[PDB]
Amino acid sequence: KRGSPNPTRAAAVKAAFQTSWNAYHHFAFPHDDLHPVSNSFDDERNGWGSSAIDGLDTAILMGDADIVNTILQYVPQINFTTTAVANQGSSVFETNIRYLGGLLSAYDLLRGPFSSLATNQTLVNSLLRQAQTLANGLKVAFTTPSGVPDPTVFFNPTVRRSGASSNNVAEIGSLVLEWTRLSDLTGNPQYAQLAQKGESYLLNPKGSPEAWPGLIGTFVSTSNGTFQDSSGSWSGLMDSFYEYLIKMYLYDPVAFAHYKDRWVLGADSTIGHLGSHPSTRKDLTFLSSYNGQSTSPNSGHLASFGGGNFILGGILLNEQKYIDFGIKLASSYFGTYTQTASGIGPEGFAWVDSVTGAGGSPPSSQSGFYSSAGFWVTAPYYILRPETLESLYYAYRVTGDSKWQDLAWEALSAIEDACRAGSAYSSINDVTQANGGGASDDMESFWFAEALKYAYLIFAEESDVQVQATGGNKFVFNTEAHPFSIRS
Ligand SMILES: *[C@@H]1O[C@H](CO)[C@@H](O)[C@H](O)[C@H]1NC(C)=O
Ligand SMILES: *[C@@H]1O[C@H](CO)[C@@H](O)[C@H](O)[C@H]1NC(C)=O
Ligand SMILES: *[C@@H]1O[C@H](CO)[C@@H](O)[C@H](O)[C@H]1NC(C)=O
Ligand SMILES: [Ca+2]
């Protein structure tokens, strides 16, 4: 059953985005996030207008001229040289992937194959200008003795480092894509130099021994860039590091060929050592976490992005093995969606390793559920994450099998039927509950940038943004689903 764009399906996703935007624009804008039930807002993203920037490119790919214009008019107004709140900490990582990524992807799209969605060239130019302004403040993060970025900085009263003594590999290794992109766009090499230097310490790990070739530790010293542990996983604190390794290779196969080699070691090592099968459902394959040569039968929604990453690597390297493994991953993680009462996957889940017998024991209430489902829930909530829709999307782009679109559709449908709340959509309390267990009154910006973006693209018409299975990709998605043009 060969696939093809599904207008009806794509329209539904576009409609969910429209609703979410209207509500956000009316009750929260220009604040960072909307609380759909109370109709209030928050500024978790330092009050720069997180949801507006994060959703900008999604609005461009959907052909939402009006929404695009609204945001473009706002960009020049943002003040990326300070924070409304004095002495307020700023996450180098979160700020980078959302703001810098969002501004750069919008810039690349509005100057590339989507330039029609914008007429005012001065507004388009603001995106890049504002990105450089932001980066000029964020760069203080690299003023550590080793060059390894400090995870937190401050802009108000002045630009300063938090002074942390260590950081995690995910936050250190998820800056290279957008900072290198910025240098290429501005002509100022400093940005790339800074990010790449901090990254260098992660490519030739010194200190704690690698659990396995390519599988590095989680925390790195800011004073000397050495590792102090041998633990890690494909989820929180490490996930996006492995992701950007292969993505940099897409951005420029020559300059970052070494990044590609570090990915292959990681990939091969997680396949031979992290792949785990639930004792009650051997046909399923999940990724365990690790510490030394020991692995733990636990995972969650964050690690579900893995499927798409292995697939991406298989495309860029013409290696079926990575594609097959990625397909299995996408499928297995979707099983945590399709088997709950709401049809939505849990935040955290666990199982019993079928080989080492490791892992706990299903809590009494989930005893029967584990027997047939192959996992039990440890963290029931869902906050509109996109990792699974992301992996399903890659699975479809590489196979062309409409079956994947059906799974994604089942995923989007389950999500809106339970997350539909107040003026738009919201995080839910209990996924193992048919109705979702009640909304927690929150609509994260990545709902706009990622979940709705991947859901739409899997049903949408062809374009340069779509990932090409037979190579020739001209774009690369950053960790927050913001596509950048490759070096060229
Ligand atoms: C941005 O904020 C800083 C500090 O409050 C201020 O000095 C500057 O004038 C502001 N810039 C704009 C464009 O208002
Ligand atoms: C947008 O383009 C118009 C041209 O019609 C220009 O007058 C305006 O200044 C631009 N936006 C801003 C305020 O930078
Ligand atoms: C590196 O710095 C850390 C502090 O973060 C310290 O514990 C460690 O001993 C240093 N390593 C060496 C040998 O320089
Ligand atoms: Ca991500």
Where are the chain's structural domains?
Answer: 1-488
Q: Domain 1-488: which CATH class?
A: mainly alpha
Ligand 2 lined by 77 (C-beta under 6 Å): no
- Taking CA 83 as the corner, what is the angle to CA 148 and CA 44, rounded to the nearest 5 degrees? 80
- Chain-centroid distance, C-alpha 338: 22
Measure 234 CA to ligand 3 centroid, in angstroms.
26
CA 217/CA 230 separation, integer angstroms = 4
Report, in angstroms and rounded to the nearest whole number, the Rg of the chain calculated over CA atoms.
21
- What kind of experiment solved this structure? X-ray
Which amino acid is present at 276? S
CA 147/CA 196 separation, integer angstroms = 9
CA 190/CA 193 separation, integer angstroms = 5
Q: Are strands 231-232 and 219-221 parallel, antiparallel or unpaired?
A: unpaired
- Three-class DSSP labels, the chain: CECCCCHHHHHHHHHHHHHHHHHHHHHCCCCCEEECCCCEEECCCCCCCHHHHHHHHHHHHCCCHHHHHHHHHHHHHCCCCCCCCCCCCEEHHHHHHHHHHHHHHHHHHHHCCCHHHCCCHHHHHHHHHHHHHHHHHHHHHHCCCCCCCCCEEECCCCCEECCCCEEEHHHHCCCHHHHHHHHHHHCCCHHHHHHHHHHHHHHCCCECCCCECCECCCEEECCCCCECCCEECCCCCCHHHHHHHHHHHHHCCCCCHHHHHHHHHHHHHHHHHHEECECCCCCCCEECEEECCEEECEEECHHHHHHHHHHHHHHHHCCHHHHHHHHHHHHHHHHHHHCCCCCCCCCEEECCECCCCCCCCCCHHHHHHHHHHCCEEEECCECCCCHHHHHHHHHHHHHCEHHHHHHHHHHHHHHHHHHEECCEECCECCCCCCCCCCECCCECCHHHHHHHHHHHHCCCCCCCCCCCCCCCCCEEECCCCCEEECCC
Measure 81 CA to ligand 1 centroid, in angstroms.
7
CA 149/CA 135 separation, integer angstroms = 13
Find the ligand nearest to 73 CA. 2
Find the ligand nearest to 453 CA. 4
Ligand 1 lined by 81 (C-beta under 6 Å): yes
Task: Tell me how far CA of residue 154 lies from CA of 158, 221, 237, 340, in angstroms.
Answer: 7, 20, 22, 42
- Taking CA 357 as the corner, what is the angle to CA 354 and CA 361, rounded to the nearest 5 degrees? 100
Ligand 2 lined by 120 (C-beta under 6 Å): yes
Residue 303, Cβ density class (10 Å: 0-12 exposed, 13-18 middle, ≥19 buried): buried
Give just the sign of the alpha carbon dihedral 170, 182, 180, 249: positive
Which amino acid is present at 303? A
Of 153, 37, 27, 30, give the one whose Cα is nearest residue 421: 37
Of 237, 235, 256, give the one whose Cα is nearest residue 247: 256
Of 478, 334, 482, 461, give the one whose Cα is nearest residue 407: 334
CA 271/CA 285 separation, integer angstroms = 10
Ligand 1 lined by 79 (C-beta under 6 Å): yes
- Taking CA 159 as the corner, what is the angle to CA 153 and CA 165, rounded to the nearest 5 degrees? 35
Q: Which of 387, 390, 430, 480 is catalytic?
A: 387
Atom number, ligand 3, closest to the C-alpha of residue 223: 2
Measure 250 CA to ligand 2 centroid, in angstroms.
36
Which amino acid is present at 426? S
Tell me whether residue 243 is one of the annotated catalytic residues.
no
Atom number, ligand 2, closest to the C-alpha of residue 119: 2
φ/ψ of residue 123, rounded to 5: -70, -40
Ligand 1 lined by 77 (C-beta under 6 Å): no
Task: Tell me how far CA of residue 189 lies from CA of 175, 258, 265, 309, in angstroms.
Answer: 14, 20, 29, 28
For a ligand 3 pocket test, name from 144, 165, 206, 223 the mutation site with the most ligand atoms within 8 angstroms of its C-beta.
223
Ligand 1 lined by 40 (C-beta under 6 Å): no
Q: Which two tokens stand for residue 118?
A: 């914008």
Measure 104 CA to ligand 1 centroid, in angstroms.
22
Measured from the Cβ of residue 85, the count of other Cβ atoms closer than 10 Å reads 11
